[PDB]
Design a protein around this ligand. Structure first.
Ligand SMILES: Nc1cc(N)c2c(=O)[nH][nH]c(=O)c2c1
Ligand SMILES: Nc1cc(N)c2c(=O)[nH][nH]c(=O)c2c1
Ligand SMILES: [Zn+2]
Ligand SMILES: [Zn+2]
Lengths: 372, 372
């Protein structure tokens, strides 16, 4: 396969369905990427993640540079080898989690200096270091290092962050290209910023396209603005990005958000929702999510979802998983997670098929009628 | 298959190797039984437990009567159906864990009344109720309800507990037999008591044989007496039990204890060691156990054990599992547990094969030379 090749097979309105070919595998889009936090998709062996239908997973750069270490993972043969996942891996830049999880973050034009929320150590993450860490990890899709703008943002602050992000996008591009091995085997995605302001999003899109990237992510969303606002922003933002390249909506995972995002042109998604779902009792079903911990499921012999085809719904009942979760049993987490990720992948398959068949709009309608 | 049929295929000294045929499956002996505490073998799907080579698992009656409830499990179709394990299941009487984990235990000739260490509720466990609960669970091998004697024990107290246990063994037998369905489909094991005293063990063995059971367990050991004393007691105790029936050593699981116990006539074992091992970093190897959390394994690319054939040793390195455990990741527990249970099953296979081939004594010697 080629280093990177995105092809759209079918369309319906703004929605697209196709594939991304990379050296390590083919990615069917719209795609959902399970998140591997500390070099592991929570409570799941990589073979199980693949069994759910996943073509690609996301790796958190922030956690990896801290815990085992980027250099260490490289010495061990790369993240793929390390965790046992031989398919594509998209890695975030680490920046977003630096601003969310780390201590004493000192920001500058050069990058960001911060303290670990673990050992209390110190690191100087920058566009160059982030690209380098992602290289050390052996990432297939590398995200440009940016600065996520907090919501709500004033036009002036949103402009400054976006402008800095565009400058950092150029530095990310150059860092990526100067590393021969990485440029020849991996892909690079740029990230659009501009908060909720149309003019800023347009300037960001133009700057990104001018630099040139393999894919374009819509950043700065799913940060407290609500679905209506997110959709309103996506309405004008997605059309600004190059049509022939993948559109990636970062940190978006509620089923209804994904459906609406695909209707607006998004091809890729990632979220912790599925993994953190079965950690509190939340299991997704076609009739809406349910909290397995509720007493009404103590003697329910039916599977988590009536039509889901995952191994969990084939083999175990709600009653058993209810008991497992309430007992604080690890198997409870394993089973809940497998089902949830499988549910998401089935959602992505239903989306891809409906687009390919020109009945996506009807699917979106039927999905919402039942889900809500 | 028959309700119960034990047959010895080979012998070497006191050691035996054979099979127990039951309706739900064949059990190869000497056998190691993984422990399913809250209706789950910690961090493992039942298919994975079977993949390690396990022919049978143990179910904790104490935990089950408390958490989901015996009656509830029965209404749900039995423990086998509930947890997804269709092979034999041996259930303890619940008594031992009543004296170890529960609050305010009030003992009498009728049984034991106690408070739950969970909700703080109250229950009246007796030989009749224990047998009944095990029936409700759908147990294949039912353990008689006894009274484990604390170590050290005075001759007088050991005698009183043993005598009470023999009276409770008779009540267990009668309770079991009066329940047609249970008597026709399940097996009943009696438990020998008498502490470290030879005369008491002899009286217990005689009383048990007089009543008649499908199997005989050596109870009252692995309670703080040390390996030398345990072995010394087994030396004279095992020969007192019927030779043509299975000999079960309860709560014994260190690899060296199992080897020495088999040399003394034991056919069945169960222990939490394997499951609680990979919870602190302990992984068993042929060169002795290792603590995966130790910094020396951070960049060790070799598998947990060099010759182990489990899926974990085929797919992941010490370095990865070291990181997972130190990161508090669930997959760390899943991988450590699978390997440890697989190691135990391989130990049981090496024991069975060496007995069948008349070279067990040599195996025991070689095993210890390397393990220590
Ligand atoms: N919701 C979001 C999640 C993310 N991981 C990111 C990011 O990594 N970079 N930039 C972003 O804007 C962003 C937004
Ligand atoms: N070590 C032991 C573990 C056990 N689960 C038991 C038991 O269940 N009954 N009686 C016993 O003596 C005993 C001993
Ligand atoms: Zn399912
Ligand atoms: Zn192994």
């Amino acid at each position: 396969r080629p280093r990177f090749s995105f092809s759209i097979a079918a369309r319906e309105g703004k929605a697209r369905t196709g594939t991304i070919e990379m050296k390590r595998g083919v990615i069917r889009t719209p795609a959902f990427m399970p998140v591997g936090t500390a070099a592991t998709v929570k409570a799941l062996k990589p073979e199980t993640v693949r069994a759910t239908g996943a073509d690609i997973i996301l790796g958190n750069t922030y956690h990896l540079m801290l815990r085992p270490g980027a250099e260490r993972i490289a010495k061990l043969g790369g993240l793929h080898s390390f965790m046992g996942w031989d398919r594509p891996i998209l890695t975030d830049s680490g920046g977003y989690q630096v601003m969310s999880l780390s201590s004493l973050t000192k920001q500058s034009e050069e990058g960001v200096t911060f303290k670990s929320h673990l050992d209390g150590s110190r690191h100087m993450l920058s566009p160059e270091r982030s690209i380098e860490i992602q290289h050390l990890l052996g990432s297939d899709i590398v995200m440009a290092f940016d600065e996520c703008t907090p919501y709500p943002a004033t036009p002036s602050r949103a402009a400054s962050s976006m402008e800095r992000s565009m400058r950092w996008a150029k530095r990310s591009r150059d860092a990526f290209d100067s590393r021969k091995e990485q440029a020849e085997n991996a892909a690079l995605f740029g990230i659009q910023q501009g908060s909720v302001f149309e003019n800023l999003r347009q300037q960001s899109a133009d700057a990104l396209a001018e630099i040139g990237f393999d894919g374009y992510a819509v950043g700065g969303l799913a940060v407290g603005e609500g679905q209506d606002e997110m959709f309103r922003v996506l309405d004008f933002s997605v059309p600004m990005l190059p049509d022939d390249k993948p559109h990636y909506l970062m940190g978006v995972g509620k089923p209804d958000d994904i459906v609406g995002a695909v209707e607006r042109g998004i091809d890729m998604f990632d979220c912790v929702l599925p993994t953190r779902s079965g950690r509190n009792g939340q299991a997704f079903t076609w009739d809406g999510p349910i909290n397995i911990r509720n007493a009404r499921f103590s003697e329910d012999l039916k599977p988590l979802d009536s039509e889901c085809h995952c191994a969990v719904c084939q083999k175990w009942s709600r009653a058993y998983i209810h008991h497992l979760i309430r007992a604080g049993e690890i198997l409870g987490a394993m089973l809940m997670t497998e089902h949830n990720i499988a549910f998401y992948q089935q959602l992505m398959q239903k989306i891809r098929d409906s687009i390919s068949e020109g009945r996506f709009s009807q699917f979106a309608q039927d999905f919402r009628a039942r889900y809500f």
